[PDB]
Amino acid sequence: GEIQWVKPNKETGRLNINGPTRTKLEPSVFHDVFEGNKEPAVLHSKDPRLEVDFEQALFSKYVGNTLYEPDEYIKEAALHYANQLKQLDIDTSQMSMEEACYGTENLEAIDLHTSAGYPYSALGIKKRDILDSTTRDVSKMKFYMDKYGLDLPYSTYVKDELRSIDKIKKGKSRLIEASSLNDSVYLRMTFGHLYETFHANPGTVTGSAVGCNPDTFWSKLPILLPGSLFAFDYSGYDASLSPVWFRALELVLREIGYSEEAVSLVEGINHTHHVYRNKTYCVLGGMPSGMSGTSIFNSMINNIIIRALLIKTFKGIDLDELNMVAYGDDVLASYPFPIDCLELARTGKEYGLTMTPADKSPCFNEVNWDNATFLKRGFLPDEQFPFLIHPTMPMKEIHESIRWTKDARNTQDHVRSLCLLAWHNGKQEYEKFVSAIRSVPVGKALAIPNYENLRRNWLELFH
RNA sequence: GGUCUCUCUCGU
RNA sequence: ACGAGAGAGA
Ligand SMILES: Nc1ccn([C@@H]2O[C@H](COP(=O)(O)OP(=O)(O)OP(=O)(O)O)[C@@H](O)[C@H]2O)c(=O)n1
Ligand SMILES: [Mg+2]
Ligand SMILES: [Mg+2]
Ligand SMILES: [Zn+2]
């Protein structure tokens, strides 16, 4: 992904889009009970913690583009993946605006506690002014779309969140693209049934884990990924996608049976326009993370990428013995023989991809179930029932969340949520966690889940 | 101050 | 089941 041009809003006639500059993350009453090295991300250009030009760091993720048209390996990869999806029988028909706005049993409705994007953001109008859950009316929406049309520019914000201090110093905060409600509901109408199918079949057939529950999915992963494992993260995944991969995505969508009208929207994703403060800018390539179906499309492109790198990098690869699941750019995959991920990365850099170990560490090493991670969680077999697998969130990542808050009114909700992650690390680590919470006044006022009840509730999930 | 998924909590 | 809120993950 590379920025093509940057004109002021005056020259493009776009309305300015004003974004918050102050973090909502105050330190919590547990801020000094637990060690930790994450701080709220840099959001103002004058953040004293900066050591690099701010706006230059945010946009440094647009590495640039390499390929524009698919080669032989990427075509073969795309078709292999697409024939895999055929067995799901995606209904490619247009979804109706009622279900697209208000949801179905396998696709939650448009979030009305969040913005409506350009231009509504600047016009003061909110999503709840167009859609009501109770009537499930679409007339108010059908009207507005007719009036502003589609291909509406994305609104660029910086994300308020705890980040590494390396990334605070180097100004590498995350950019999100606020979709226009019009673009969002049109994508849902075009691809609603594919979203539905993906959410309802996490696993190695979608090659996706969107919709999975780690508490139960982890026990299946060793069965869905037999053989020797490998695993990746990508550095700057969304911006690092050259337009070739969107062409390759069109190949997949055609081959599962979408109309020439439907695949035409892919170019609207490969080629996007964004407002940030008082400027407009055009991005070619790169996924606009914040669009409808971000996770699902990131995951599908990843299935294409991995396949394409294997058959290009190694002779004698057989893509039918490959199992993988992707959640966005997180990969966990397996193959009957060991795969030298160092070579897949060399290939990726040729396509403009920066592949890294899952942990984002400096060297690749062998990956097996005892050191694997997916969605930050490890794999730890139960002591009594070794075929059940605990998703283990590391205690350090739990300690970092508990040290901050966006509203102390929710302290108990927060700690409870964290306890439900923590106890998979076992009774000793868990009770060390709970004793720490109890070592401060507010902690002794909180209801904390009892370990055995958590373990009993977990074991009941398999009945 | 986006798209999603998952889990929890509070309400007839 | 339906509404309200939270946390985590991508
Ligand atoms: N809050 C987030 C985080 C992730 N993503 C999507 O998931 C992708 C990968 O997630 P992640 O690895 O966390 O971010 P990266 O872009 O790869 O940056 P990094 O180098 O830090 O891994 C992103 O590119 C983005 O498209 C998202 O939409 N919203
Ligand atoms: Mg990444
Ligand atoms: Mg990732
Ligand atoms: Zn353009």
Closest ligand to the CA of A163 = 1
Is residue A400 lining ligand 1, measured as CB closer than 6 Å? no
The residue length of chain A stands at 463
Cα gap A321→A324, rounded to integer Å: 10
Token pair belonging to A238: 């969304």
Alpha-helix runs per DSSP H in A27-155: 54-58, 72-86, 97-102, 120-123, 139-148
Q: Which of A335, A338, A329, A328 is nearest to A364 (CA)?
A: A338
Asked if A290 CB < 7 A from strand C, the reply is no
Determine the Cα angle at A106 with ends A292 and A297, to 5°: 35
- Angstrom distance (rounded) from CA A188 to CA A178: 16
Instruction: Give the residue from A253, A356, A259, A239 showing the smallest Cα distance to A300.
Output: A253
A255 Cβ within 7 A of any nucleic strand C atom: no
Q: CB of residue A411 closer than 7 A to nucleic acid strand C?
A: no
Binding site members of A for CTP: 174, 236-238, 289, 298, 360
Residue A59: closest CA among A184, A233, A177: A177
Question: For residue A330, what is the DSSP state?
Answer: E
Burial class (CB in 10 A: 0-12, 13-18, 19+), A381: middle
How far are the Cα atoms of A108, A222, A239, A362, A369 from residue A100, in angstroms, in the given order? 9, 35, 28, 43, 39
Distances (CA, A) of A115 to A38, A129, A176: 27, 11, 13
Separation of A236 CA from ligand 1 center, angstroms? 7
Assign 3-class secondary structure to A370-382. Answer: CCCCECCEEEEEC
- Which residue lies with its CA nearest to atom 18 of ligand 1? A236
Is strand C in 7 Å reach of the CB of A23?
no
CA A305/CA A383 separation, integer angstroms: 37
Question: Does residue A439 approach strand C to less than 7 Å at its CB?
Answer: no
Bridging pattern class, strands A378-381 and A389-392: antiparallel
Residues 360-389 of A with CB under 7 A from strand C: 375-376
Binding positions of A: 174, 233-234, 236-238, 271, 273, 282, 289, 298, 329-330, 360
Tokens encoding A116: 């409506």
Instruction: Name the helix (H) or strand (E) containing A405.
Output: strand A404-405
Find tokens 């971000």 and name the residue: A294
Beta bridge partners of A3: A283
Residue with CA nearest to B10's C1' atom: A413
By C-alpha to C1' distance, B8 is nearest to A417
> What DSSP state is assigned to residue A268?
H
- Output the six-digit token pair for A180: 């226009």
Q: How far apart are the first and last CA of chain A?
A: 47
Q: Is A71 buried (19+), middle (13-18) or exposed (0-12) by CB count in 10 A?
A: middle
Nominal resolution (angstroms): 2.5
CA gap A240, A236 in Å, rounded: 6
Structure tokens at A40: 């709220």
User: How many angstroms is C1' of C9 away from CA of A214?
Assistant: 10
DSSP A209: -
Structure-token match 């994007």, residue found:
A117
Percent helix, percent strand, percent coil in chain A, to nearest 5: 40, 15, 40
**Residues in Cβ contact with A21 at an 8 Å cutoff, skipping those fewer than 6 apart:** A43, A44
d(CA A31, CA A403): 4
- Return the closest-CA partner of residue A332 out of A229, A411, A218: A229
Give, in Å, how far the C1' of B11 lies from the CA of A112.
Answer: 19
Residue whose CA lies nearest to ligand 1 atom number 7: A328
| Distance separating alpha carbons of residues A351 and A307, to the nearest angstrom | 14
Determine the residue of A176, A177, A233, A330 to mutate for testing ligand 1's pocket, defined as the one with the most ligand atoms within 8 A of the Cβ atom.
Answer: A233
CA-nearest of A280, A288, A285 to A5 is A280
DSSP category for residue A136: -
Atom of ligand 1 nearest to the CA of A234: 17
Report whether A391 contacts A29 (CB < 8 A): no
Give the H or E element holding residue A157.
strand A154-158
Cα separation, A366 vs A31, whole angstroms:
36
Strands (DSSP E) contained in A213-339 are 228-234, 271-276, 279-284, 323-327, 330-335
In this structure, are residues A331 and A324 in contact, taking their beta carbons and an 8 Å threshold? yes
Burial of A231 (0-12, 13-18, 19+ CB in 10 A): buried
Return chain A residues 117..156 having CB < 7 Å to nucleic acid strand C: 133
Name, in order, each residue with C-beta under 8 angstroms of A225's C-beta and a sequence gap of 6 or more: A204, A323, A324, A325, A332, A333, A334
Triad A44, A49, A52: Cα angle to 5°: 80
Dist. CA A265–CA A418, nearest whole Å: 40
- DSSP per-residue codes, A238-269: TTT--HHHHHHHHHHHHHHT--HHHHTHHHHH
Query: Which residues are within 8 A (CB) of A213 and not within 5 positions of it... i.e. 6 or more apart?
Result: none
